[PDB]
DNA sequence: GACGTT
DNA sequence: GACGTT
């Protein structure tokens, strides 16, 4: 093991993260020190760097020293920490390209090699920058220095950057200076910049001289300099009235601009000239402003025709929600628009008029309308749009499947579904109706127009499933989530019909998780098409106490590949039950039951079983027969049990075993005799009271597989 | 330790339960064996009893051998077990009074001492009884023998009891013979019986000769002999039509009868003569019959005037729910009635007419109306009743506090509360509105008529709490449960006003548990009256990351005694936070957070703290200073952490410490040096990998306090 | 110094 | 025999 206590990985990277080290490990001389190209020392306890820490690292290109010595405000305990660096610490490494010194209490910029390409000094204690700090860094392309004077990392004044301090850096393209209490753009920046992030300072005034000779700018973030603290979740200083102040020419010379962020700048309107001169503008973030009235009447969206993404979120009135909301005619052009975000504006009624302008935009794929407090939604409207893939109407008060037409209505106040809500939505493939108030008796009459519907999420509701023909109007339905509808199912003395599963010809995924199903339920679940059933969070235990009434509950699911029986209060698991389970099963999850014993031999009953998960049960040991012969098991999880010992040879027969999780048990050793091993690719043996005086050799033979604390003896 | 492996307790009882013993521990000769009056050997592995097992137990009066050798059907694994008993096993104990042999595969009744007063042979393998089996048991007062021939413990035939087999038992008062596949009452029973339980057999016919000369009967259970399997949750054989058959004189000679159970006897009506002759009848269970039409028209409730409890539940029609439901006029008399249970009949409308008959009954305290599928409920009706203490309308579709007027509406489909629902309910003191669909903006206008309301449970709803005057119409409200309303609180970018707490002058208990409160919330909670706040299941962690905005969140709760911050994702807990917490605190719960460190000294900041709960966190050890001086802590729970060691003297200063829970950690010893001990009353050191070769002496000195497995070495 | 997966 | 808090 060449680099203890650190870990050798591919791409010449050495991981020393989270080892609570007090200094940089020099490593023994015999190591291949020239081979290391990357060294990560994240979140250690290193408060002092030395000339000799990285000197022998001959091909070091990436170095990460993040979170070693956080300033008092960023320290979880608020411990002050001052990181000292010897003069030639990094000069000693003339190959160094990527240096991250963020979340470290250093007070000035150290001497750096001229090879450095990227430097992060974010959340450090550096309050001053001059030209001398960046002498001869001709390769430096990225400079991060966010968060050096703000509420979480305070300074009595602000970050000071002298005029032309970075002007000598001719290769610099990326510059971030957020949360530094600035009151103006630092003067004379390198014209090479393409990204400039000055957000969350207090640059409350702006002219073209502030962005002077920065003609290569591609992205410009200036938001949060003039904030609306009514919407703030963190410390916030309100923007004075009669601010902010810009003037038309500010951005006119930025012809290469593609992204402009003006969020949280207390804007009641925009000024055309700002944009007239930005012909390349793709993404515009106007969120958290006061543009509620502006967007109803504005004509500025004409000749913003190259715009692709537009964020208008939280442009809400302080005290009210609007009755209606009509978008200006100018939104119709906007022919390049792909994503429109209008969440958090607050309007109660969504109609045909509301989104009239947007109806003909040929590329509009995403419309975000959540958190608007909408009571009434005319959903047929969405059938009119040519390119719509995602409509989010979640968190309102209305009353695979990435990359197909999806409508998210979750977190609304729907009580009954009527089929007339889905007029014009025959194209819809995925519908989320999660977290509603739906108490309807679903009887095959709710979703009739939704003929393309492939996914229906109805979790977190009160659906009463007594009719045998529930969801029968969706024979093309592939996935149905009926978890967290426990209120109907937990009714005592009331029956529950699950026969409808048999009536859904193309259903592949079903969830009945967390329903508390425990008695008076259908005796058999039948389906030829179902591949995965989540039956977690039920009381299969109590069902299997009721004689043999429920012995063949899953048997009728003929082609079932995955079954989840986690959290079913199972104190025991007979060969009986396993034998009457579909023989097609490749994955069986049994997490967090109450199993103190497990007949391993009876696994033979499931010849196809590749994945078994017994985590969180109460196994005291691995014994009572080994893993049986012929077993196809590639993944086994027995973590968080009380496993105190393992019978010799216990795993051996698992010829396929790839991943084994033994963590959080009561093991005092790890013996090879348990396996026959080399094959094994993941061996998790963490959180075990390991005694430390058989494994030291064995564990180091198979170190590539092992991703490991002693409990003994001090 | 006189009785290892068993445990000596008060009342001369020796606990040997759940020790997986293979035989009865004889104990060393030196023990005070004459002092033991009771021996419990529940759920051990004892399949063989011997003459010498209890011979030295000179004053044994109670013996429990339950669950030692369960029959195949009752065995969790379905292991057959046959329990052998030597002839004089119990004869060897002439003082024996109470013998429980239930859940043991014995095939005949053993020889028993004449001192025996109570005997249980339930769920054993005894299929025959004769007079010889009970020779000379003149004291025998109680005989249990339920469940010896039924689905969970099958026999090919039935239990056979010869005529007059128990007739020699002149002191016998209690007899249970349920689930034994009987087809008639066993003939000539002792006239001394006062309780006779024959339920769940198949006694489908009944005449007075079956209860011949049993004039001292006080309680008679004959239900489930003639069942309706449509409502059954377990194996069930339907009752043939033209059955059951009784005739008027069956019960006429039972003048001392107080309780009659006729549940699940497929009754479409009752026959007067059955009851005409039972002047003492207090409790009548008619549940699971077909009495839906009978109770609308019957006149039998006249001259059932001494009846106190009446169960009519699940008297429902197979395929339907009734539109209305009018109770017969005869219910009005019935002047002795205290409890009426009418759940599971299924009717959609509850009106003034429905319960008209009951309106004037002077003692009616409990009316159970849950699980009826009621859509419309005229709640003012209940204001008319003179003695009503509990009305349960839970699990319907409507659209301290034991011993005061309570209305449970939980598990209905209420979306908005209107004050006009509570007209006439000014007397109501407790209201459960849990698990509804309530999405209302509570603004001080919902509960106006409820002037006596002391308890309001509004958990599991979607209450939006934005108005500062929510619940302001209840200034007398003492307890408010607002847990599991996370949908409003988890809305991102939306504020949440908790100022209303300050506006409730007499509020003592508040629950905000499991709301996901994490940001944009009131900065301070103020209240002079609040004594306990449950703030579990929130994100106080994220709130306390947002600078010092939330440093004084609980401070304004001036007289707060109990605070629950369990499950708040707390990775750390500064002296800061503790210091800005009410100084009145006696209980602080922090279960199941992510705390890997704890500054114990900073407990000094809470001088009144008697109870601290740190269970389920991630403490690796008890160190970093001991419990600080002056600490008033009487209960400390650090179970289910990863505590590997304890600094010496760690507890010492906790002069008051009464209860300490150390279970489920990584301890290898238990040292006295941790304490200074004698005071300590509960010391839980279970589920710890204890090494076993300092504690053996110490733990036995303080054995009275300790209620303990080795993990080492085999 | 310590703390902690930010 | 074993299993498990029924």
From Swiss-Prot, chains A, B:
- In its UniProt entry, what is this protein called? Toll-like receptor 9
GO terms, molecular function = pattern recognition receptor activity; protein homodimerization activity; siRNA binding; unmethylated CpG binding
PTM comment text: Activated by proteolytic cleavage of the flexible loop between repeats LRR14 and LRR15 within the ectodomain. Cleavage requires UNC93B1. Proteolytically processed by first removing the majority of the ectodomain by either asparagine endopeptidase (AEP) or a cathepsin followed by a trimming event that is solely cathepsin mediated and required for optimal receptor signaling. Palmitoylated by ZDHHC3 in the Golgi regulates TLR9 trafficking from the Golgi to endosomes. Depalmitoylation by PPT1 controls the release of TLR9 from UNC93B1 in endosomes.
Going by the UniProt record, its keywords in alphabetical order are: Cytoplasmic vesicle, Disulfide bond, Endoplasmic reticulum, Endosome, Glycoprotein, Immunity, Inflammatory response, Innate immunity, Leucine-rich repeat, Lipoprotein, Lysosome, Membrane, Palmitate, Receptor, Repeat, Signal, Transmembrane, Transmembrane helix
What is a biological process (GO) this protein takes part in?
Answer: positive regulation of MAPK cascade
How does the entry describe its membrane topology? Single-pass type I membrane protein
Q: Which residues lie on this side of the membrane: Extracellular?
A: 1-714
Its assembly, as annotated, is:
Monomer and homodimer. Exists as a monomer in the absence of unmethylated cytidine-phosphate-guanosine (CpG) ligand. Proteolytic processing of an insertion loop (Z-loop) is required for homodimerization upon binding to the unmethylated CpG ligand leading to its activation. Interacts with MYD88 via their respective TIR domains. Interacts with BTK. Interacts (via transmembrane domain) with UNC93B1. Interacts with CD300LH; the interaction may promote full activation of TLR9-triggered innate responses.
Instruction: Show the GO cellular component annotation of the record.
Output: early phagosome; endolysosome; endoplasmic reticulum; endoplasmic reticulum membrane; endosome; lysosome; plasma membrane
Q: Which residues of the full protein are shown?
A: 29 to 792 of 1029
Q: What does this protein do?
A: Key component of innate and adaptive immunity. TLRs (Toll-like receptors) control host immune response against pathogens through recognition of molecular patterns specific to microorganisms. TLR9 is a nucleotide-sensing TLR which is activated by unmethylated cytidine-phosphate-guanosine (CpG) dinucleotides. Acts via MYD88 and TRAF6, leading to NF-kappa-B activation, cytokine secretion and the inflammatory response. Upon CpG stimulation, induces B-cell proliferation, activation, survival and antibody production.
Here the disulfide bonds are 6-16, 69-81, 149-155, 226-239, 229-236, 401-430, 692-710
Q: Which residues are modified by glycosylation?
A: 35, 100, 171, 181, 213, 311, 352, 404, 443, 497, 599, 624, 661
The protein's organism comes out as Bos taurus (Bovine)
Q: Which positions are lipidated as S-palmitoyl cysteine?
A: 229, 236
What family does this belong to?
A: Belongs to the Toll-like receptor family.
> Subcellular location, in the record's words?
Endoplasmic reticulum membrane; Endosome; Lysosome; Cytoplasmic vesicle, Phagosome
User: Chief location of this protein?
Assistant: endoplasmic reticulum
LRR repeats: which residues? 33-56, 58-81, 93-118, 121-137, 138-161, 169-192, 194-213, 214-239, 254-277, 279-303, 304-327, 334-357, 361-384, 401-424, 426-449, 450-473, 475-502, 504-528, 530-552, 557-580, 582-605, 606-629, 631-653, 654-676, 677-697
Which residues are involved in binding DNA? 18-22, 43-48, 66-80, 103, 150-152, 179, 233
Domain of life, per lineage: Eukaryota
